[PDB]
Design a protein around this ligand. Sequence first.
Ligand SMILES: O=[N+]([O-])c1ccc2nn[nH]c2c1
Ligand SMILES: O=[N+]([O-])c1ccc2nn[nH]c2c1
Lengths: 301, 301
Amino acid sequence: AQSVDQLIKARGKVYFGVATDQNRLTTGKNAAIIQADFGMVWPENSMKWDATEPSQGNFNFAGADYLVNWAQQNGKLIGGGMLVWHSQLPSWVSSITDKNTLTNVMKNHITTLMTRYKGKIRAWDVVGEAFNEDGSLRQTVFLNVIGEDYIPIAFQTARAADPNAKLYIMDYNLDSASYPKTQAIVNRVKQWRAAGVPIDGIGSQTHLSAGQGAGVLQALPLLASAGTPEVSILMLDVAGASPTDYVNVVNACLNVQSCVGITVFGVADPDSWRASTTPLLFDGNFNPKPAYNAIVQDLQQ
Amino acid sequence: AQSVDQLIKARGKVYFGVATDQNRLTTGKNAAIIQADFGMVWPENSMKWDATEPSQGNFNFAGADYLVNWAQQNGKLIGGGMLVWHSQLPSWVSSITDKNTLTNVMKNHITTLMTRYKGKIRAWDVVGEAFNEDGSLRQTVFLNVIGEDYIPIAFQTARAADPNAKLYIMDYNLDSASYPKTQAIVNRVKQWRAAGVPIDGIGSQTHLSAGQGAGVLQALPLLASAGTPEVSILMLDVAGASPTDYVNVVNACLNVQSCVGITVFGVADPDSWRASTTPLLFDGNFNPKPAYNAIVQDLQQ
Ligand SMILES: O=[N+]([O-])c1ccc2nn[nH]c2c1
Ligand SMILES: O=[N+]([O-])c1ccc2nn[nH]c2c1
């Protein structure tokens, strides 16, 4: 089956990517499909905070190491995250109330992960899901204890740890241009970058319902108006996996000069976090679905 | 769907189990099927040596902790392994040439894992795949460096770490009573048990091709002739998933008084290590397959 990564590279983009991990690569047909058809891998779970630092200073890198090794042996790009995120956050972190302690705990978590893989990771999602739906900053432990400068500190710490990685902020429900969360993140990123914060990218965690593809054609250009060097579409899946929805998201990428690529959130439907909505590009028999073929067609023209 | 675990408990057995791990329980329909239909879980990868001790004395428990917690919350039995195995073995272990050092490394690995989950684990696979196909002992780093006492030492150490747990040796290609490996593990286990080695169980890692189920009716009673308190069928899958092959394996279990239960190597076909042979009991849409219903009927007759 024709490679969507090759085709999107031929249209001037960097990658078509997919989330995976060790036990995906040793089961099913996932390794063969990724080798043939995708240009970048992301860790489905193995770089999250509760997988990598379940207790203070007790780092667990076996899973992440496997993925990074596999990607290098097979000539794929590699992304990483979530470095700073309130979900799947171990209790030992959320129980901290001292500002200096939490600051150093955050800095050490960022520095340790990025150092280990220094120079091998194209992009890191440094901070994720930092905004409320009304556009105010989400009141996580980091905001409550450190304050609003936790985002500047995180990005400056990450830039120091690996200056070769592109540093992203990411969030979800950025899929419509009239939604308050979309314009808020644009405005805050503008202001942070004007003050010298090294935010290289905005990543849009794109979990869509049927029919919401079309809206990304006007949301993604808006996200790009923040002036970051890059934007990306991340963790993509679409309930029903209609070709129309998937083609609209791909075309939004193509229409936006700074959008470097697209990452789908898994290979085959039965391995999706919402498998009953069959929202991915390959079915339970690892056959390409009509949406995969529609994307190929769209990219060929 | 009717629960094969409830039905096999009704026939006087302990469990019908499945291998799983954290990212299976958060994707597909695996958690719901396990909750409804299976009585025991085993770690697909999270307790192997490369996952738990990737550098000497530095242990990684995030993935294993998740599985143990989930099982306790949902009222399921838990198994564990492999403690001593030549595959998925970090290179820091396989490069040790000193007998004392390797003995202590092996004992520390066993003792640390078993102590952490002391009293919570029904059975541990202490030693796996220790035999060659001709019935001689496999020349692994443990055999080359420590000698054949490594198996006695492993079991003695395991018994002291958690006396509640059932201790197993396991291997594959024990599916034919006339195959030399089958008689060889019987010979050795009888000798070890006569020397007081605490081997509670032989686990048969049952990876079958079409038509091989019938032979297990003779092989499993032969394995039981070693006199261990228990035997089990583990990591079960069958190319083609013929009802006749699966029912023959279940009936071998039922016929052998010391056989405590059966564990299948995953829930749904696309998540198998040999998915193209569709060898499991649920298909790529998470529907029970003919073999599942045939097992249900067999357990009710
Ligand atoms: O795009 N992605 O599928 C993806 C998956 C996991 C991640 N963790 N951090 N960023 C991620 C992106
Ligand atoms: O029964 N099993 O499927 C199973 C899976 C993994 C294991 N590791 N040790 N024993 C195991 C059994």
